[PDB]
Amino acid sequence: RASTKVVVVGGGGTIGSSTALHLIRRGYTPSNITVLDVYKTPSLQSAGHDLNKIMSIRLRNGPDLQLSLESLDMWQNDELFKPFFHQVGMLDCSSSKEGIENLRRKYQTLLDAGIGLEKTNVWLESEDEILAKVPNFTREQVKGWKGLFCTDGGWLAAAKAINAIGIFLQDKGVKFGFGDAGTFQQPLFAADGKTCIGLETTDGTKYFADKVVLAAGAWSPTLVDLEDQCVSKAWVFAHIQLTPKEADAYKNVPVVYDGEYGFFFEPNEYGVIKVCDEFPGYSRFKLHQPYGAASPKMISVPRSHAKHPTDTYPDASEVTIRKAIARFLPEFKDKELFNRTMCWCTDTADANLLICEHPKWKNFILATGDSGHSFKLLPNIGKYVVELLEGSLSQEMAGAWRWRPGGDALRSRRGAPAKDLAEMPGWKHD
Numbered sequence: 001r002a003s004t005k006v007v008v009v010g011g012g013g014t015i016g017s018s019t020a021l022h023l024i025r026r027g028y029t030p031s032n033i034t035v036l037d038v039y040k041t042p043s044l045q046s047a048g049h050d051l052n053k054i055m056s057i058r059l060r061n062g063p064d065l066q067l068s069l070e071s072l073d074m075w076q077n078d079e080l081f082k083p084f085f086h087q088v089g090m091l092d093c094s095s096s097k098e099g100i101e102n103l104r105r106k107y108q109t110l111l112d113a114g115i116g117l118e119k120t121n122v123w124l125e126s127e128d129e130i131l132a133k134v135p136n137f138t139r140e141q142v143k144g145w146k147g148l149f150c151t152d153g154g155w156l157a158a159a160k161a162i163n164a165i166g167i168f169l170q171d172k173g174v175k176f177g178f179g180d181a182g183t184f185q186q187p188l189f190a191a192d193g194k195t196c197i198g199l200e201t202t203d204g205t206k207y208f209a210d211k212v213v214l215a216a217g218a219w220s221p222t223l224v225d226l227e228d229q230c231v232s233k234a235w236v237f238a239h240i241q242l243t244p245k246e247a248d249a250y251k252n253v254p255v256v257y258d259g260e261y262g263f264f265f266e267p268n269e270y271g272v273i274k275v276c277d278e279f280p281g282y283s284r285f286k287l288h289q290p291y292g293a294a295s296p297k298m299i300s301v302p303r304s305h306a307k308h309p310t311d312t313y314p315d316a317s318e319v320t321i322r323k324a325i326a327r328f329l330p331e332f333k334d335k336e337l338f339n340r341t342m343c344w345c346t347d348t349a350d351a352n353l354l355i356c357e358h359p360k361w362k363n364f365i366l367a368t369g370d371s372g373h374s375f376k377l378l379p380n381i382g383k384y385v386v387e388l389l390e391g392s393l394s395q396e397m398a399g400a401w402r403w404r405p406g407g408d409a410l411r412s413r414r415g416a417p418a419k420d421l422a423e424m425p426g427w428k429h430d
């Protein structure tokens with residue numbers, strides 16, 4: 001272990017940072033760990049390079065529950081992560097007949113687990129209980145709304161937390177490569193052409209290691225052939241600027257989320273509110289040849305805002321973002337938006353992670369399939385990547401995260417197939 005060399009591709013993003021953090025915590029020697037990314041520090045294009053992410057408990061399968069609970073504990077109690085968890089609660093609400101049904105089911109599932117989640121997860125049946133948790137709302141704004149309130153949840157200062165890990169890693173002596181020195185191009189193989197011995201970057205720099213971890217997020221299926229198990233998709237956000245007076249009225253407000261509208265966060269320290277809508281995501285299919293594919297293939301390739309800073313998002317997303325504002329922040333309907341952005345994740349067909357050794361390449365570990373909801377696992381997801389690397393990962397977890405082509409990841413569990421950027425005008429200003 002003190003002898004084992006590991007390269008983490010995508011080490012500037014969420015799963016890569018966590019993996020590098022846990023390699024150190026488990027006693028790997030820091031000079032033996034190499035972190036590679038296109039972008040330095042917290043990578044500009046990482047899905048974790050954000051003002052804020054939601055912290056909440058999700059319960060779809062067994063792993064989801066264990067991982068959620070452990071991660072919540074570390075956000076609350078881990079010295080490294082504590083400064084970046086804002087435990088302001090999260091309201092999940094609805095007013096549509098079908099949306100309240102989904103919410104009642106969410107509450108029952110928490111109940112049915114029977115391990116105490118209903119203590120910190122409270123049903124809000126009347127507008128007056130909603131207004132007590134969110135005073136900024138008015139009574140007429142919340143007419144007909146029902147809520148499930150997670151007193152345990154809140155939001156995570158995402159980019160700041162990733163930066164904190166990176167500072168820790170640098171202080172311990174981990175090696176880094178960025179730019180074309182850190183841009184993965186292909187694995188390197190022993191004489192057998194199937195045992196991985198390292199990787200090459202686009203400049204020809206060859207890194208040799210016992211294990212290679214591919215934590216390249218939405219770019220993972222573009223870099224190596226995942227047999228179309230993963231479809232990368234974009235979601236959207238924009239920012240609004242509050243006056244100091246308005247910003248004060250919103251301090252410590254809980255995260256508010258409605259699956260038919262979107263969600264928003266309390267102002268950051270500069271008075272900026274991030275607003276998101278909720279929808280099935282955007283694909284951007286384009287001819288590309290991932291390593292290991294026999295031919296160029298039509299696959300969803302992120303259109304990176306870091307690479308194309310004039311990009312915004314589609315006009316259809318301008319409509320739905322302004323609908324979220326009108327529902328949650330009706331007094332701000334005339335505020336101008338800025339920093340319109342597309343942010344990329346990669347869905348699997350069943351919305352579980354893809355964390356496994358590549359079927360044919362020994363010592364090449366995939367660690368992706370984040371499916372748009374894994375940033376909350378920053379403190380602990382790396383623990384299980386290292387467990388897999390070591391051969392100690394539980395069989396139920398390995399099974400849930402295994403190599404498993406065959407499903408429809410374009411629909412995934414979103415209830416509609418992502419629409420493509422080629423059919424959605426308004427985002428490109430080239």
Ligand SMILES: Cc1cc2nc3c(=O)[nH]c(=O)nc-3n(C[C@H](O)[C@H](O)[C@H](O)COP(=O)(O)OP(=O)(O)OC[C@H]3O[C@@H](n4cnc5c(N)ncnc54)[C@H](O)[C@@H]3O)c2cc1C
Pocket residue numbers: 009010011012013014015016036037038039043044045046047048049052053054055182183184185215216217218219223234235236237276343344345367368369370371372373374375376377
């Ligand atoms: C709009 C939006 C809102 C979200 N909100 C939430 C939320 O509230 N809560 C939550 O839990 N999750 C949320 N998510 C999902 C969450 O952000 C992701 O699941 C998670 O951050 C993905 O982590 P990752 O490590 O797989 O990818 P990333 O963090 O994107 O890391 C991938 C890394 O790989 C690097 N890379 C790419 N290509 C190469 C290459 N060729 N060589 C080397 N490195 C490379 C990239 O630069 C990047 O640093 C949201 C996602 C979106 C889009």
